[PDB]
Structure 1
Amino acid sequence: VNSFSGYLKLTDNVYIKNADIVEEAKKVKPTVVVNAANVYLKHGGGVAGALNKATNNAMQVESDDYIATNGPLKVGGSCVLSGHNLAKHCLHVVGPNVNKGEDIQLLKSAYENFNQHEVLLAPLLSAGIFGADPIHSLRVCVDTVRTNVYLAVFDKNLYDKLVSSFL
């Protein structure tokens, strides 16, 4: 039993809600919140910019030290950093950016990172400015993640479409 509220169950292990991941994190304070990061951990906009803003830029400061030490992440890769005031941990996951020509097949690799954590609050990956189709991303999530994932979908129209088209 966890403190997530009002989620629609999609499968044995996937739950979905029309919600802002930042507001969900502030309310629930989950063990793990997923960021839809880029390889540079430059948290400018979307999920990343909004999460970072909610940490008063502490996420960016921590991330810049991480990159200075370790270099960029791989597309499809991840790192675990602090969740600051939003969660215990933040799993920064890089999905492919289709507007950069990156391979959509790497979206499955990106979601595989979720399997290292028993429970996560997460956004849809690659489906923002990264240009991928959100229907496909949800299908990949469901077919890849085996741990318990609570998906926060920002756009109401998209949420309705994802639910009504979910197979």
Structure 2
Amino acid sequence: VNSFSGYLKLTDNVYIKNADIVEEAKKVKPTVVVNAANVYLKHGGGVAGALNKATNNAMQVESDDYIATNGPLKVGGSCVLSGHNLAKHCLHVVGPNVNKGEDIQLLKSAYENFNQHEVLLAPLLSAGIFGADPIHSLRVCVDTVRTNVYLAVFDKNLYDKLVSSFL
């Protein structure tokens, strides 16, 4: 039993809710919140900008030190950093950005990072400003992630479409 509430069960291990991931993280304090990161960990907008804003920019300060030490992430890769006031840990995962011409096949590699964590609160990777089809992203998630994932979808219209079209 865990503290996630109000989710629709899609599969054995994938759950979904119309929710603001920032507000959901603030209430649940999950072990792991996933950020929709880019390779530079520049958290300017979308989910990343919202999460970072909720940390009062502490996420960005920590991220800048990480990059200065380690260099950029790979598209499809991840790193574990602090969850600040939102979660124990933040798993920064880089899905391909279609608006940058990155290969969508890398979306499966991106979701594989979730399998290193037993339970996660997450957005749909490569959705929103990353330009991928969220229906496709959900399919890859379900077919790739084997650990327990609680997906937060900000847009109510999109949430209803994801549920209604789910096979």
TM-score (norm 2): 1.00
- After superposition, the CA RMSD in angstroms is 0.3
Q: Spell out, residue by residue over 1:91-110, the C-alpha distance to the aligned partner (whole angstroms, 9 max, x if none).
A: 00000001111000000000
Q: Spell out, residue by residue over 1:79-126, the C-alpha distance to the aligned partner (whole angstroms, 9 max, x if none).
A: 000000000000000000011110000000000000000000000000
Distance, in Å, in 1 between the alignment partners of 2:100 and 2:88 is 32
Distance, in Å, in 1 between the alignment partners of 2:48 and 2:77 is 16
What SS does the aligned partner of 2:52 have?
helix
Q: Spell out, residue by residue over 1:4-46, the C-alpha distance to the aligned partner (whole angstroms, 9 max, x if none).
A: 0000000000000000000000000000000000000000011
Alignment of structure 1 residues 93-132 onto 2, 5 Å: 93-132=93-132
Distance, in Å, in 2 between the alignment partners of 1:116 and 1:63 is 20
- Report the Cα offset of residue 128 of structure 1: 1.2
Where does the alignment leave 5 or more consecutive residues of structure 2 unmatched?
A: none
Distance, in Å, in 2 between the alignment partners of 1:107 and 1:128 is 14
State the aligned residue count: 167
Where does the alignment leave 5 or more consecutive residues of structure 1 unmatched?
A: none
Aligned to 2:141: 141
Deviating 4+ runs (over 3 angstroms): none
Q: Spell out, residue by residue over 1:109-154, the C-alpha distance to the aligned partner (whole angstroms, 9 max, x if none).
A: 0000000000000000001111100000000000000000000000
TM-score (norm 1): 1.00
Distance, in Å, in 1 between the alignment partners of 2:58 and 2:43 is 11
Q: Spell out, residue by residue over 1:53-82, the C-alpha distance to the aligned partner (whole angstroms, 9 max, x if none).
A: 000000000000000000000000000000
What SS does the aligned partner of 2:114 have?
helix
What SS does the aligned partner of 1:129 have?
helix
